[PDB]
UniProtKB/Swiss-Prot annotation:
Changing residue 8 to A: Decreased binding to single-stranded methyl DNA. This is Protein RDM1. The keyword Manganese does not apply. It comes from Arabidopsis thaliana. The chain holds residues 43 to 161 of 163 of the full protein. It is found in: Nucleus, Nucleoplasm. The keyword Lipoprotein does not apply. One of its GO terms (biological process) is siRNA processing.
């Protein structure tokens, strides 16, 4: 059941193309905020694992973030990690993660943002 949801989620996320954009600069002051600007400008979802990681990076800081990591590089890093999260995880692993995290749907993008 969770397993079917994981399988359908992952089968879908694995095929979503990474957008082709060299020549982008999105100023930002938190990782989660940069991710919201990316999801809105490109009209893309980011994966559960990427949303969780972005929130951890923001927690680890507790100066504008974009004066520390340039936006072009920051955005590229999110896309590269997102590609790992789309192409590599097994749905079984995702089902197991979701079974242990009652808040897990808060890190899944809505279908209609
Ligand atoms: Cl931001």
């Amino acid at each position: 059941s969770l397993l079917r949801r994981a399988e359908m989620y992952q089968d879908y996320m694995k095929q979503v193309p990474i957008p082709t954009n060299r020549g982008s600069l999105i100023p930002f002051t938190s990782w989660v905020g940069l991710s919201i600007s990316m999801k809105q400008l490109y009209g893309q979802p980011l994966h559960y694992l990427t949303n969780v990681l972005l929130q951890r990076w923001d927690q680890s800081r507790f100066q504008r973030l974009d004066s520390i990591i340039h936006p072009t590089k920051a955005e590229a890093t999110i896309w590269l990690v997102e590609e790992i999260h789309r192409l590599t995880p097994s749905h079984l692993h995702m089902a197991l993660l979701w079974r242990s995290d009652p808040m897990y749907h808060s890190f899944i993008d809505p279908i209609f943002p």
